[PDB]
Ligand binder design. Structure first.
Ligand SMILES: CCCCCCCCCCCCO[C@@H]1O[C@H](CO)[C@@H](O[C@H]2O[C@H](CO)[C@@H](O)[C@H](O)[C@H]2O)[C@H](O)[C@H]1O
Ligand SMILES: CCCCCCCCCCCCO[C@@H]1O[C@H](CO)[C@@H](O[C@H]2O[C@H](CO)[C@@H](O)[C@H](O)[C@H]2O)[C@H](O)[C@H]1O
Ligand SMILES: CCCCCCCCCCCCO[C@@H]1O[C@H](CO)[C@@H](O[C@H]2O[C@H](CO)[C@@H](O)[C@H](O)[C@H]2O)[C@H](O)[C@H]1O
Ligand SMILES: COc1nc(N(CC(C)(C)F)c2cc(Cl)c(F)cc2F)cnc1C(=O)[C@H]1C[C@@H]1C(=O)O
Ligand SMILES: COc1nc(N(CC(C)(C)F)c2cc(Cl)c(F)cc2F)cnc1C(=O)[C@H]1C[C@@H]1C(=O)O
Ligand SMILES: COc1nc(N(CC(C)(C)F)c2cc(Cl)c(F)cc2F)cnc1C(=O)[C@H]1C[C@@H]1C(=O)O
Ligand SMILES: CCCCCC/C=C\CCCCCCCC(=O)O
Ligand SMILES: CCCCCC/C=C\CCCCCCCC(=O)O
Ligand SMILES: CCCCCC/C=C\CCCCCCCC(=O)O
Ligand SMILES: CCCCCC/C=C\CCCCCCCC(=O)O
Ligand SMILES: CCCCCC/C=C\CCCCCCCC(=O)O
Ligand SMILES: CCCCCC/C=C\CCCCCCCC(=O)O
Ligand SMILES: CCCCCC/C=C\CCCCCCCC(=O)O
Ligand SMILES: CCCCCC/C=C\CCCCCCCC(=O)O
Ligand SMILES: CCCCCC/C=C\CCCCCCCC(=O)O
Ligand SMILES: CCCCCC/C=C\CCCCCCCC(=O)O
Ligand SMILES: CCCCCC/C=C\CCCCCCCC(=O)O
Ligand SMILES: CCCCCC/C=C\CCCCCCCC(=O)O
Ligand SMILES: CCCCCC/C=C\CCCCCCCC(=O)O
Ligand SMILES: CCCCCC/C=C\CCCCCCCC(=O)O
Ligand SMILES: CCCCCC/C=C\CCCCCCCC(=O)O
Ligand SMILES: CCCCCCCCCCCCCCCC(=O)O
Ligand SMILES: CCCCCCCCCCCCCCCC(=O)O
Ligand SMILES: CCCCCCCCCCCCCCCC(=O)O
Ligand SMILES: CCCCCCCCCCCCCCCC(=O)O
Ligand SMILES: CCCCCCCCCCCCCCCC(=O)O
Ligand SMILES: CCCCCCCCCCCCCCCC(=O)O
Ligand SMILES: CCCCCCCCCCCCCCCC(=O)O
Ligand SMILES: CCCCCCCCCCCCCCCC(=O)O
Ligand SMILES: CCCCCCCCCCCCCCCC(=O)O
Lengths: 149, 149, 149
């Protein structure tokens, strides 16, 4: 039961750890540019690192949501592998963005490709669990009993 | 097992897709107002669209959390319908806010009403799974065995 | 089945309610300092309360992710208790930060300690569900069948 989802839980935990890493980098920039809470503005370099962390934070719940839907309704290994590709592409996005706004783009598109792939696996998984049942009911003349609307 | 939660997974996926839509709108405003990363400040219109996306992002994990608690402990269909009302009210909030800060308010209250309804269904669901067991133990003089505290 | 995770669902719901409380406090500061949407800048006090809510929002999905992994793979009661310690430390962080940036630090470290503890329980739980199986396969000379890589 539990170990049917243990790989998804492991990829989730690795994402939490990546977020802690991004957070550690912003704490470091905060010393390196004397940025003092409660402020988020500062030199362009600090501003880039800080924006990279905010962006990764916005998308972290989206990644988790699709990872779990894809892993449960499609295939656990397929979703987990795709989750790892997304996480590694985000690490590179962060490191890229810290150096320059242009250098963030190649790993940003790689991560966008990986997240859309997870959205596609989630959609396919959901369709695989609804379309066959609807097909069976339609062929048996029992569709109204499955969905009156 | 899986299809006991397939409607919640479908509503979750639709919310991820709505977030991608909001993100596409901010990318468009970014060209229309020459706002260049790493900046989030700009004309009041861009500022409104950008704030709308930030707000929807803050609340997206809250919506997911209550949707899943309500859908598992209350009733799956009730929670899923309520999730759809929330998602559609957020689309209208976004479109409203893009035009004016006042025009965002009616769909914002509609979405606040829909999210509180999901919080209420989650609370009711949780109570339905704890209060009867506690009542049974109290009536049987076995409460200490269920909860010593 | 459901009540195997009902305590985790209850702690989740309490976190959603805490977030609604933080949100109510920022709405109040917004009147008290005439900050008008779409703006997030203002007096240092408003700026502190607003930053406190943003920080709690960034970490809310991280807390949920680890609470569920720890509660499912480690022990439900252990994770749920730890989740409560984290939530209460965040309330104090918020109240502290509202008064001063220095006063936020003691409950911030308390919440950081509580979240790392949840990360540790999640990691331990995941290891408890993989390392014994790998040990059994290695001892039986059946490791390649469990993991070819
Ligand atoms: C209302 C909607 C109407 C229904 C429309 C249906 C959409 C049709 C889209 C194509 C159908 C799915 O096509 C299928 O895709 C997946 C993933 O790309 C492939 O799947 C394979 O590669 C993926 C890579 O991500 C692996 O994770 C997976 O384990 C493996 O089986 C299949 O080899 C292919 O056959
Ligand atoms: C420590 C706490 C002490 C216990 C206090 C208990 C609180 C009492 C509150 C009212 C009890 C629940 O009351 C119940 O609400 C739900 C939802 O509104 C209604 O439920 C109905 O409408 C909702 C609409 O959201 C549908 O999704 C649901 O499928 C349907 O059954 C019931 O018809 C009503 O009987
Ligand atoms: C590739 C990795 C290699 C494997 C390395 C393994 C790491 C070893 C770390 C120590 C092993 C776990 O050690 C174990 O920790 C937990 C939590 O702190 C304790 O657990 C106890 O306290 C915790 C407090 O959080 C309670 O929630 C829990 O219900 C209770 O049983 C155990 O009494 C201790 O024996
Ligand atoms: C994966 O990250 C991102 N995805 C985005 N989209 C939205 C669009 C409309 C492009 F599709 C998107 C959404 C979903 Cl659901 C998905 F499955 C895949 C995606 F690509 C958009 N922006 C980012 C960023 O992080 C940029 C803010 C960072 C920067 O510009 O530096
Ligand atoms: C649903 O969205 C929102 N909900 C809010 N609350 C918090 C309060 C104290 C009002 F209850 C709230 C919280 C929970 Cl848990 C809920 F179940 C229902 C809710 F209404 C508050 N603000 C928004 C916004 O999006 C505003 C930032 C956007 C803007 O002002 O434009
Ligand atoms: C629990 O909150 C926080 N945790 C942080 N880290 C990241 C570091 C590198 C410190 F470990 C962290 C990450 C994980 Cl995964 C965890 F398990 C425990 C943690 F401590 C960091 N910052 C906060 C804040 O809220 C600060 C922004 C608020 C402020 O500075 O006021
Ligand atoms: C492992 C526990 C770590 C807890 C997270 C630490 C977070 C933030 C510390 C920011 C310190 C305040 C910055 C200095 C500003 C000033 O002194 O003027
Ligand atoms: C509704 C599902 C959207 C599917 C998006 C597919 C994208 C794939 C990129 C590789
Ligand atoms: C809503 C339609 C779902 C189909 C999307 C999947 C597409 C391509 C995956 C390769
Ligand atoms: C692509 C998105 C697909 C959506 C359709 C999935 C609906 C699942 C309904 C299954 C049965 C149920 O939960 O009652
Ligand atoms: C491979 C595609 C074949 C699809 C078959 C669909 C067949 C018939 C559609 C008519 C349904 C209307 C009859 C109502 C009776 C009922 O289903 O309860
Ligand atoms: C489907 C893949 C889409 C990936 C998401 C694209 C995101 C961001 C692109 C922002 C471009 C940089 C803005 C221009 C600023 C300047 O040139 O001065
Ligand atoms: C603890 C649960 C809070 C209940 C909030 C109920 C709100 C309903 C609005 C319709
Ligand atoms: C903690 C109390 C839970 C009850 C809240 C539900 C109330 C109203 C739903 C109609
Ligand atoms: C409204 C919030 C209600 C909270 C009470 C639910 C507690 C669930 C305990 C069930 C048994 C268990 O998990 O050991
Ligand atoms: C419909 C409301 C009826 C509630 C009934 C509650 C009854 C008695 C409360 C006394 C409990 C203290 C006895 C301790 C013994 C034990 O439960 O283990
Ligand atoms: C229970 C429903 C509550 C819904 C959440 C309310 C949220 C925001 C209201 C902000 C009001 C606009 C501020 C005044 C600015 C101005 O008039 O110039
Ligand atoms: C990979 C798991 C990291 C473990 C962090 C342990 C921290 C404990 C603080 C008490
Ligand atoms: C990846 C290693 C996991 C072990 C971390 C747990 C450590 C300490 C808990 C007390
Ligand atoms: C500490 C992080 C530990 C990670 C290892 C857990 C991997 C779980 C694999 C279990 C079997 C499976 O899902 O096929
Ligand atoms: C308590 C620690 C004991 C660890 C025991 C590990 C033993 C042997 C490692 C050799 C594995 C290589 C053999 C390949 C055959 C197979 O497992 O399929
Ligand atoms: C963050 C997305 C929600 C998590 C998905 C819940 C797991 C479903 C359980 C399948 C049985
Ligand atoms: C890309 C990896 C291949 C698909 C992964 C299959 C293993 C997961 C099992 C399942 O949940 O059906
Ligand atoms: C911090 C995330 C790193 C994970 C790197 C492994 C991704 C490649 C999967 C093939
Ligand atoms: C985002 C909230 C957590 C997701 C809820 C986990 C689903 C519980 C599984 C029930 C069996
Ligand atoms: C408003 C819709 C009516 C309640 C939905 C009941 C179907 C869900 C089944 C369940 O999980 O008990
Ligand atoms: C993008 C979300 C749109 C969903 C619209 C349907 C909501 C109404 C439910 C009755
Ligand atoms: C937010 C983290 C994802 C939620 C965890 C899903 C619950 C797993 C179900 C175990 C059976
Ligand atoms: C600290 C509390 C002690 C551990 C909690 C054990 C109860 C949870 C049951 C389980 O999921 O194994
Ligand atoms: C709003 C969260 C408050 C919860 C307070 C109880 C935490 C202490 C657990 C021992």
């Amino acid at each position: 039961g539990k170990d049917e989802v243990a790989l998804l839980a492991a990829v989730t935990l690795l994402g939490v750890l990546l977020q802690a890493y991004f957070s550690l980098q912003v704490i470091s920039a905060r010393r390196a540019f004397r940025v003092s809470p409660p402020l988020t503005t500062g030199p362009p370099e600090f501003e880039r690192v800080y924006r990279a962390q905010v962006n990764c934070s916005e998308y972290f719940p989206l990644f988790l949501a699709t990872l779990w839907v894809a892993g449960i309704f499609f295939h656990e290994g397929a979703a987990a592998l795709c989750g790892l590709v997304y996480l590694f592409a985000r690490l590179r996005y962060f490191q890229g963005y810290a150096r320059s706004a242009q250098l963030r783009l190649a790993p940003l598109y790689a991560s966008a490709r990986a997240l859309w792939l997870l959205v596609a696996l989630a959609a396919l998984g959901l369709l695989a669990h609804f379309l066959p049942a609807a097909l069976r009911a339609a062929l048996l003349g029992r569709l109204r009993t499955l969905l009156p609307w």
